[PDB]
Design a protein around this ligand. Sequence first.
Ligand SMILES: Cc1cn([C@H]2C[C@H](O)[C@@H](COP(=O)(O)O)O2)c(=O)[nH]c1=O
Ligand SMILES: Cc1cn([C@H]2C[C@H](O)[C@@H](COP(=O)(O)O)O2)c(=O)[nH]c1=O
Ligand SMILES: [Mg+2]
Ligand SMILES: [Mg+2]
Lengths: 208, 208
Amino acid sequence: MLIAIEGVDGAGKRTLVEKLSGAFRAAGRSVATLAFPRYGQSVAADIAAEALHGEHGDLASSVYAMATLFALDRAGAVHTIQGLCRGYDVVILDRYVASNAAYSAARLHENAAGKAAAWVQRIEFARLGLPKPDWQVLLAVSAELAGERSRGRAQRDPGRARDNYERDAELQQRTGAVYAELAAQGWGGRWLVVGADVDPGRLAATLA
Amino acid sequence: MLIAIEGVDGAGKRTLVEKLSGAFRAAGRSVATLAFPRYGQSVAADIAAEALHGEHGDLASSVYAMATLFALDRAGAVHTIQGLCRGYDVVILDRYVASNAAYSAARLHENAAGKAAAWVQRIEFARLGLPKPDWQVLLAVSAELAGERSRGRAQRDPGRARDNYERDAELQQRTGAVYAELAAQGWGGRWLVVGADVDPGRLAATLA
Ligand SMILES: Cc1cn([C@H]2C[C@H](O)[C@@H](COP(=O)(O)O)O2)c(=O)[nH]c1=O
Ligand SMILES: Cc1cn([C@H]2C[C@H](O)[C@@H](COP(=O)(O)O)O2)c(=O)[nH]c1=O
Ligand SMILES: [Mg+2]
Ligand SMILES: [Mg+2]
């Protein structure tokens, strides 16, 4: 089973991944986890991150360039994903293809039925052959609360300064709204929308 | 030995590669050839080409995005290049890293000592670990003549329509001038500047 955890910056995704993996393991399932972008493991992922911190000239000003780098990062992990799905009961992703649709649409002021989300579908699922997830879980959080979490993280960690997307409050709000539409539409596969108070034991039961 | 053939669009590079490989083989050397971008062999190369023909939204409007895709294409061929250099006497490339420096600088109206060429050095040779060529051969041609060749090619071949860079005459002229500076500077390794009338037998002797 392939599960993707989605949502805006500072939504609590990495914590939900650890809680969910604990819940599956408590129920006897083997769990593997992977997080995109794969910082350190691909040049595409690292250049993208650096571009969001102000490097690499005009790269980050192109919406489709940034999307392409994240897609190329995932394309480098296809055989890895397919291998994990063979070896493990549950594979849990911290961000996946839907992050590219939500952020790209939001940067362009488009909705979930617009051009960017359709491009992401065409490139990543069809052309690059990335598997569609069995479940995509939207961790829906107020944009204000998520933004406070990102700010807090940068304050206490010098290696977690906010990037260009995190600093853009209105982008984060628009991205939350596109994500809600993608879930309602069942984009890429079925979605669950959960809040910050979701129970990990029940959540894993729904997904099992 | 690793040789790169460089120069503007329509300069006659692919023909020089075939003539040069013939000259080396006539002298008893095994020759392997590779052409960048590697259309068909990498997603980065294909997306870049499609972006230059008007696809993928705002991708082609970023100079650093386009450079990054060509660099990522080459990064996918590093082990291939290293393998060819082990197995063959002469490896001949139709375009290599210097194409990224010349076109990127030209798009930004920079010269060979500017920021883009320095970025290409830092990313491709140092960070990605692409081998520096033993020889880079600049096939220097009038920009007007090269532009006529590109136009002619599109006229007789429906699968060779000109791309955004080929249609930009002033970009092609600026790119020729940056290339001349890169050669004079010995950027990336030693250069030879040849004309359209260069003798392939003598050229191969110089390079052998
Ligand atoms: C994985 C991914 C992230 N992004 C964004 C969301 C974040 O603001 C940023 C870096 O991801 P991060 O928040 O997980 O660590 O890039 C995309 O636009 N597309 C993608 O495919
Ligand atoms: C290989 C390469 C090509 N280019 C350009 C030159 C051409 O106008 C175009 C496509 O290459 P092509 O002319 O060999 O077939 O992209 C770069 O800007 N950087 C590179 O690294
Ligand atoms: Mg973030
Ligand atoms: Mg061309």
